[PDB]
RNA sequence: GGAUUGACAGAUUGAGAGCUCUUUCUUGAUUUUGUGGGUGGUGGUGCAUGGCCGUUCUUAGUUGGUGGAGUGAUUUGUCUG
């Protein structure tokens, strides 16, 4: 189980997340969502 | 098991440029590219045009209808004062 959830304002907890090592970050929250959940 | 944008911060780069990376998701086919066509084009010729303007040019000039002169190009009318 990998690649956990965002705080995406568009839909409530409903995306997978494009993440490097040691972070957690959405694929459309490109200008927002600094803290990795 | 996404044609492709773009992804915090760290050397960048006008900065939150994923421009390039240290690298993985979404609205989902509307285009990564294979011809053939305008293209942004102000880099294209006003020597192919319009339209406009300037000029010839604050000067007095121009033409056709009848008839005359000349075979005719053309003159006359449009003039000596
Ligand atoms: Zn979403």
Essential attributes:
1 chains; little secondary structure; 0% helix; 0% strand; binds zinc ion; RNA-binding
Architecture overview:
It is found in: Cytoplasm. The modification Phosphoserine is found at residue 7. This is Small ribosomal subunit protein eS31. A zinc finger (C4-type) spans 6-29. This protein has 37 residues and is mostly loops. 0% of the residues lie in helices and 0% in strands. The protein contains no helices and no strands. The structure holds zinc ion (ZN). The site of zinc ion has 6 residues, from loops. The protein binds one RNA strand of 81 nucleotides through residues 3, 8, 15-21, 23-36.
Task: Please outline the helices and strands.
Layout: no helix or strand
This protein binds zinc ion.
It binds one RNA strand of 81 nucleotides through residues 3, 8, 15-21, 23-36.
Number of helices: 0
Distance between the ends: 16 Å
> How does the overall form come out from the CA principal axes?
globular
**Total count of strands:** 0
Percentage of β-strand residues:
under 5%
Bound compounds: zinc ion
Helical content class = under 10%
Radius of gyration in whole Å, from Cα?
9 Å
Largest sheet composition: none
* Secondary structure category: little secondary structure
Protein name: Small ribosomal subunit protein eS31
Subcellular location: Cytoplasm
Organism: Saccharomyces cerevisiae (strain ATCC 204508 / S288c)
């Amino acid at each position: 189980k990998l690649r956990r959830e965002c705080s995406n304002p568009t839909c409530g907890a409903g995306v997978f997340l494009a993440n490097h090592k040691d972070r957690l970050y959405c694929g459309k929250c490109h200008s927002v969502y600094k803290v990795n959940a």
